[PDB]
Design an enzyme around this catalytic site. Structure first.
Site, short mmCIF file in Angstrom:
data_model
loop_
_atom_site.label_atom_id
_atom_site.label_comp_id
_atom_site.label_asym_id
_atom_site.label_seq_id
_atom_site.Cartn_x
_atom_site.Cartn_y
_atom_site.Cartn_z
CG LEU A 72 -2.21 -0.86 1.10
CD1 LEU A 72 -3.30 -0.30 2.00
CD2 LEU A 72 -2.69 -0.95 -0.34
CG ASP A 73 -0.56 4.88 -1.67
OD1 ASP A 73 -1.52 4.55 -0.95
OD2 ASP A 73 -0.70 5.57 -2.70
CB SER A 74 1.36 7.77 2.62
OG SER A 74 0.86 8.90 1.93
CG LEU A 75 -3.93 9.60 -0.79
CD1 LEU A 75 -3.43 10.69 -1.72
CD2 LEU A 75 -5.17 8.97 -1.38
CG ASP A 76 -4.03 3.03 -0.72
OD1 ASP A 76 -4.99 3.64 -1.24
OD2 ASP A 76 -3.20 2.38 -1.39
#
Ligand code: CDL
Ligand code: 3PE
Ligand code: 3PE
Ligand code: EHZ
Lengths: 128, 156, 127, 86, 172, 605
Positions: free
Chosen positions: D40-44
């Site tokens: 995942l990424d930070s904006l998830d």
């Protein structure tokens, strides 16, 4: 689109809408460093006294004591009879007292003028 | 418990005592804002921003959660003004100028032509309440001794 | 970017210390060790037949409950209330004042007996 | 209302994370770090916690939101916040 | 200490679509405009230039203030909710317990016996944790409000009593 | 003869639970049930005075104990048995008994449930001696006991500071109202030379300008009309049974109850009625306007209460006192259901109270579904229901009369909005999809709820007839009117159902909603709480320190008289004592004293 949200004394401007909040820069970058550093020490010794097992007392707040003096006793030691204080003192002092004098005296003489020939009705006004 | 030197005194004159006052109020020198020495006895007490306790972040751990106010840090000269119970100056979704204009424009609409309303009353094509016994002169508190003026009304 | 290891190793230290804290906040089966109290005989014969639990047993339990509540909440008030008006308040004149019942043409008075004459012939209004 | 045990709350978070389409329903793990292990990424993270704040009814603070990125450490914070003990 | 460029957009997103949920109400309506909110959020992911990125913050917040629900939705337990600090009427601090009369502490003997043992742990670990604190404080006090953990075994993490013995969220 | 004793007992037997509570003999548990039985038995006791009333119609005054022989003034404990009193009593006891049943359902985890029930009873006493009060002092006894108990009751959980803020706000707005109450007392004692209501009617104040506006201001306080309205919507902050009983059906209507009790004197002055039409009109429009776009489950219905209050006091505005009392009974019946129903679904829905997360409860909780629909239909004026016999009869009355021009259009437009938020509350909360949190704990199978709702349910269905027919005709019947406005009491609610339904459906249409300026106006309660609770409160209390405390008392008043004379002695007492000690200077001064004595002032000459 949408003009703005203009702030006022009672409608303050939020930090989200604050331009300087989004204008971060190196010299104010270190300026916000000691904000928490000062706070960190004030949270340290407070908690130290807060959770001391032998602490049987009230942890006096020097800021609180300072606030009490400033709002109770310090006003006159640092008071100055500058002209502004005189108008403010006179306007909020003898001002309303004389204003109510005009209102109350006018009715009292008007009422006394009316009764002295009997225009005001006191057919059942006995419980004076 | 506390000594004399950390108490509110005179409004600072020199930057040196301005810095000393700031440390007395356990705040740094560059944000120390003594109250304007116009004519009042504010002394060296700093001018904290005129912001209510509500604007302080609720999620942040506050030593006094009721006041959302920490320990030792300088408190506002008007803490009671800006406590949660009292006056709150938290930001509103719509501007303060538009805040009052719509409210004032509302009530102005009511009263201004409610006068127009009362000068042009609404009713039905009805006549007066034709009443017997001289418009109930006797039974409406009229004097029985004095003969009333006859109020009579014939059919149509 | 996330916790820096140290804070976590600390939080679980607080977690297990918090684990034991309200793992000591419960009560053993004996506590609260109820201190003895003097007991009236009234509940003794209420439970002497309550253990059966069949319909009519608890019904008469509620039936007395309603009546025993009634006497001490609707009988003893009207006992002293009626004493208060009929012999103290009404003994003072103009304290209790009554609307005279609205007599209509054709009614009769118990004391006088005279009938109020019936109102004259109606204009014969029919729809 | 009956309380939720550590098994129950770990089971509740198990359902919502498994339902997520971005993750794969066989690689899910209680200690699986979000942005690296599940990719995942930070904006998830942001949409994860509101989907976590939804079925639980309360709000984890923003200051504790960015570090709330491990399913085991997910339940550790909630269990701490509700002090629900089996 | 810092709301850097990372969290600001993360908080901005959180308040953005929560307001959208307050607007769309219906789940199907909310989901469409949520993914559009998401898709429009990362359409400019590659924005290496920070000045434009800070600029992109400006058109994020001012219309958020315009576009926020005039009746914003808040869950009961969070700031502004209908149940915030609702149960403070029942949360009484733990220190009131030792004031209980002999009859009152004989009322619940096992808890008081365990409470005494809990008081023991604080007493002979306080001097250890404050000493542990002092040897690990940086000069001029701490530079961050975060507390250090338990360095070695046995000693509890410093300054632990109140955060552990905090009254339960649902005391009654 | 029986009339005096039975009604008095309905007051006396209502107070034993208070005294038993002070005796502490109650071992909890049984106390709430004990309180309910007393109120229920008080209701059953309160019937036989009412059934007596329709048989003959006797109305008495029960002045019993003399308090003050104050010269010509004769203060005594006086209760006036009249139609307004003896009929409102069973209605008041009915609603409070059923919600006393409801209170145990909701608050079962409250450790102070006994204190709560004691508070409910203590209010009931303070309201009881208010509705049946013959002298004005007893009216103030009720007028102030009820307000004080609100501060205790909606400030139940001291806890959150917002609860205390609502407590301070509610008492302050109530404090503004009774200023007119005290004004009326001063005028009545001075001019009319009495405080009992019936003497004031006898003395026939045909031009009672000052007392009537003060009474109107007093009604504006407790009824939460304009100027003093926002304390009603903020009063929801307390427990829902408090908000369901106090300021939904009983307390807020007590303000309207003052004007009707003074109706024989009110109608003499034509001018005093013009603001009653004015006040009640705009209140109905504004309160309904806020209710349209509100979200809190209690905010919508609380605004509906205030809108109802504006509607009923419009009637006494246009010479309809008894019809206002007719509305006092119907409104207390179904409005309690609407608040109690919302309280029920709050508890089931994990204390969630925003319509955005309700929905889908139409099938999950059918009993509350049926109660609200027919409760709202009475609220909207479903013909031949409890609401129609009052509300639509009122609309048929007000539109056909000599009244202010537009003032008939709020009650027309507000009724359209009155039906409008009823559809919104039905559509969002019960219809639609189940947007609530995934874990479902909802349940309404507890018999305490089912009986509590059902008790007023047959009331909210069958009361309308059983008050309309039995009461003697006391208003002129509207017989001949045009067809259009006679039906407009029913037509207006139709587009209120229709247009709101389409507007509510717009949420189903899949398209973004632009924030309208008028929508922003309605969401902030029409901007009144934002401004009036910010500007006037800050300015006056800032004056309390900058001008009142610091400027005058701490600085000016203490520097004019005391410190000046303190400094006058201080300023030059120095050289009075500071002398060089030289014999030269002392004896030279003795020279001047000699010359001034015998030469300059010349005491000899
Ligand atoms: C007056 C209030 C009466 C009710 C009461 O006590 O409320 C307590 C109540 C507070 O109760 P609480 O919050 O549960 O107290 C908790 C504490 O922990 C303290 O209580 P606790 O938790 O220990 O126990 C629960 C409960 C149980 O009560 C107690 O524990 C205290 C008992 C108090 C009396 C102690 C002595 C008893 C023995 C001597 C008297 C025997 C009787 C014969 C004489 O406590 C109370 O009720 C508190 C009572 C405090 C004294 C109130 C004044 C007593 C008389 C003086 O007070 C209020 O709510 C304030 C109401 C103020 C009046 C508003 C309306 C006024 C209207 C005008 C007056 C009437 C005019 C005439 C009308 C009719 C005309 C025909
Ligand atoms: C035409 C006549 C209009 C009369 C209007 C009177 C009401 C407006 C002034 C008083 C407002 C009091 C009030 O309710 O303040 C509310 C304020 C904030 O509470 P709230 O509004 O609920 O907002 C959410 C808070 N969590 O909470 C507080 O402000 C609490 C502290 C209040 C301290 C000041 C109390 C009032 C002082 C005087 C105000 C002016 C009174 C003028 C009276 C005129 C009478 C003729
Ligand atoms: C006889 C008929 C007389 C005229 C009757 C006019 C009103 C008819 C009924 C309208 C019902 C509208 C409604 O229920 O709207 C619900 C909606 C809720 O809010 P939401 O879901 O967010 O949708 C709006 C955008 N946010 O909220 C809205 O859509 C807001 C609608 C606001 C309408 C205000 C109308 C005011 C009319 C009187 C003005 C007096 C001025 C003086
Ligand atoms: C009511 C609501 C109305 C609507 C309200 C929301 C605003 C709608 C209008 C659009 C405004 C704006 O263009 C986009 C916005 O929302 S904000 C600014 C985002 N600017 C960046 O992203 C660049 C900087 N970059 C980073 O900060 C990191 O790269 C990041 C943390 C994102 C990495 O995370 P990674 O993607 O996981």
């Amino acid at each position: 689109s949408f003009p703005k949200y203009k702030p006022s004394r009672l409608a303050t401007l939020p930090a989200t809408l604050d331009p300087a909040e989004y204008d971060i820069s190196p010299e104010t970058r270190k300026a916000q460093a000691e904000r928490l550093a000062i706070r960190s020490r004030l949270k340290r010794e407070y908690l130290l006294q807060y959770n001391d097992p032998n602490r049987l007392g009230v942890i006096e707040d020097p800021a609180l004591i300072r606030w009490t003096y400033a709002r109770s006793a310090n006003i006159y030691p640092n008071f100055r009879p500058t002209p502004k204080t005189s108008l403010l003192g006179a306007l909020f002092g003898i001002g309303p007292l004389f204003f109510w004098y005009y209102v109350f005296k006018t009715d009292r003489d008007k009422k006394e003028k009316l009764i002295q020939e009997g225009k005001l009705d006191q057919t059942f006004n006995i419980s004076y | 418990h506390v000594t004399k030197d950390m108490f509110p005194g005179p409004y600072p004159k020199t930057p040196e005592e301005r810095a000393a006052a700031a440390k007395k109020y356990n705040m740094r020198v560059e944000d120390y804002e003594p109250y304007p020495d116009d004519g009042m006895g504010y002394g060296d007490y700093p001018k904290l921003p005129d912001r209510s306790q509500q604007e302080r972040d609720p999620w942040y751990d506050w030593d006094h959660p009721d006041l959302r106010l920490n320990w030792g840090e300088p408190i506002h000269w008007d803490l009671d003004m800006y406590i949660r119970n009292r006056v709150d100056t938290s930001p509103t979704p719509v501007s303060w100028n538009t805040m009052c204009k719509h409210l004032s424009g509302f009530v102005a609409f009511m009263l201004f032509m409610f006068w127009v309303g009362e000068i042009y009353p609404s009713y039905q094509p009805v006549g007066p309440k034709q009443y017997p016994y001289n418009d109930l002169y006797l039974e409406r508190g009229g004097d029985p001794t004095k003969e009333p003026e006859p109020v009579v009304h014939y059919e149509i | 970017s996330g916790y820096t290891p140290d804070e976590k190793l600390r939080l679980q230290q607080l977690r297990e210390l918090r684990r034991r804290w309200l793992k000591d906040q419960e009560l053993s089966p004996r506590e609260p060790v109820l201190p003895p109290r003097r007991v009236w005989p009234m509940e003794q014969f209420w439970n002497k037949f309550l253990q059966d639990g069949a319909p009519w047993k608890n019904v008469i339990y509620k039936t007395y409950r309603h009546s025993i509540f009634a006497v001490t909440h609707v009988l003893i008030p009207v006992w002293i209330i009626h004493y208060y008006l009929k012999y103290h308040v009404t003994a003072k004149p103009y304290t209790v004042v009554e609307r005279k019942p609205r007599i209509f043409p054709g009614d009769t008075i118990l004391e006088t007996g005279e009938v109020i004459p019936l109102m004259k012939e109606f204009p014969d209004q029919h729809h | 209302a009956p309380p939720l045990t550590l098994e129950a709350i770990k089971d509740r978070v198990l359902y919502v994370l498994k339902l997520y389409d971005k993750i794969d329903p066989e690689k899910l793990s209680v200690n699986s770090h979000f942005m690296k292990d599940l990719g995942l990424d930070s904006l998830d993270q942001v949409e994860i916690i509101m989907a976590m704040e939804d079925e639980f009814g309360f709000e984890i603070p923003d200051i504790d939101a960015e570090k709330l990125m491990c399913p085991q450490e997910i339940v550790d914070y909630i269990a701490d916040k509700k002090d629900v003990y089996e | 200490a810092y709301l850097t460029h990372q969290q600001k957009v993360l908080r901005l997103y959180k308040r953005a679509l929560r307001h959208l949920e307050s607007w769309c109400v219906h789940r199907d309506k909310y989901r469409y405009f949520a993914c559009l909110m998401r898709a429009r959020f990362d359409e400019h992911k590659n924005e290496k230039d920070m000045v434009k990125a800070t600029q992109l913050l400006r058109q994020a917040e001012e219309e958020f203030w315009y576009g926020q629900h005039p009746q914003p939705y808040i869950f009961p337990e969070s700031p502004g909710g209908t149940s915030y600090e609702r149960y403070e009427c029942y949360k009484v601090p733990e220190w009131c317990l030792d004031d209980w009369h002999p009859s009152e502490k004989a009322m619940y003997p096992d808890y008081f016996a365990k409470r005494e043992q809990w008081k023991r742990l604080r007493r002979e670990s306080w001097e250890r944790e404050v000493k542990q604190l002092q040897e690990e404080t940086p000069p001029g006090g701490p530079r961050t409000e975060a507390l250090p953990p338990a360095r070695k075994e046995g000693d509890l993490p410093p300054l632990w009593w109140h955060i552990v013995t905090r009254p339960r969220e649902r005391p009654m | 003869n029986p009339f005096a004793s039975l009604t008095l007992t309905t007051l006396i037997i209502l107070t034993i639970p208070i005294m038993m509570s002070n005796s502490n003999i109650y071992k909890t548990n049984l106390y709430p049930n004990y309180v309910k039985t007393t109120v229920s038995y008080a209701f059953t006791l309160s019937l036989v005075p009412l059934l007596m009333f329709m048989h003959t119609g006797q109305e008495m005054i029960i002045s019993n104990w003399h308090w003050m022989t104050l010269q010509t003034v004769e203060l005594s404990l006086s209760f006036k048995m009249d139609y307004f009193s003896v009929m409102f009593i069973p209605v008041a006891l009915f609603v409070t008994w059923s919600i006393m049943e409801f209170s145990m359902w909701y608050m079962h985890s409250d450790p102070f449930i006994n204190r709560f029930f004691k508070y409910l009873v203590l209010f009931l006493i303070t309201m009881m001696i208010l509705v049946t009060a013959n002298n004005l002092f007893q009216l103030f006894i009720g007028w102030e006991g009820v307000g004080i108990m609100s501060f205790l009751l909606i400030g139940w959980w001291h806890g959150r500071t917002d609860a205390n803020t609502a407590a301070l706000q509610a008492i302050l707005y109530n404090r503004i109202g009774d200023i007119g109450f005290v004004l009326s007392m001063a005028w009545f004692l001075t001019h009319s030379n009495a405080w009992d209501l019936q003497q004031i009617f006898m003395l026939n104040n045909e031009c009672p300008n000052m007392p009537l506006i003060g009474l109107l201001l007093a009604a504006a306080g407790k009824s939460a009309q304009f100027g003093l309205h926002p304390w009603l919507p903020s009063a929801m902050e307390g427990p829902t049974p408090v908000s369901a009983l106090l300021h939904s059906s009983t307390m807020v209507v007590a303000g309207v109850f003052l004007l009707i009790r003074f109706y024989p004197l009110m109608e003499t002055n034509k001018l005093v009625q013009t603001m009653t039409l004015c006040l009640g009109a705009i209140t109905t429009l504004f309160t309904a306007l806020c209710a349209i776009t509100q979200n809190d489950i209690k905010k919508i219905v609380a605004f509906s209460t205030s809108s109802q209050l504006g509607l009923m006091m419009v009637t006494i505005g246009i010479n309809q006192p008894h019809l206002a009392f007719l509305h006092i009974c119907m409104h207390a019946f179904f409005k309690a259901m609407l608040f109690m129903c919302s309280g029920s679904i709050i508890h089931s829905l994990n204390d969630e109270q925003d319509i955005r997360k309700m929905g889908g409860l139409y099938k999950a909780m059918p009993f509350t579904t049926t109660a609200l629909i027919i409760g709202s239909l009475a609220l909207t004026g479903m013909p031949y229901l409890t609401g129609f016999y009052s509300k639509d009869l009122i609309i048929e009355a007000v539109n056909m009369s000599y009244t202010n021009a537009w003032a008939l259009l709020m009650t027309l437009i507000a009724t359209s909005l009155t039906a409008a938020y009823s559809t919104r509350i039905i559509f969002f909360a019960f219809l639609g999809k189940p947007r609530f949190p995934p874990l479902v704990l909802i349940n309404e199978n507890n018999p305490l709820l089912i009986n509590s709702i059902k008790r007023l349910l047959i009331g909210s269905i069958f009361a309308g007839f059983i008050i309309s027919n039995n009461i003697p005709p006391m208003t002129v019947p509207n017989t001949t009117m045009p067809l259009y406005m006679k039906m407009t009491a029913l037509i207006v609610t139709i587009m209120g159902f229709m247009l709101a339904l389409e507007l509510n459906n717009t949420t189903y249409y899949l398209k973004f909603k632009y924030p309208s300026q008028t929508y922003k106006f309605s969401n902030m309660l029409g901007y009144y709480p934002s401004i009036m609770h910010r500007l006037p409160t800050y300015h006056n209390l800032s004056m309390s320190q900058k001008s009142a405390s610091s400027l005058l008392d701490l600085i000016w008043l203490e520097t004019i008289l005391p410190k000046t004379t303190s400094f006058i002695q201080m300023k030059m007492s120095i050289m009075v004592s500071n002398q060089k000690g030289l014999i030269k200077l002392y004896f030279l001064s003795f020279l001047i004293t000699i010359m001034i004595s015998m030469t300059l002032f010349n005491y000899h000459e």
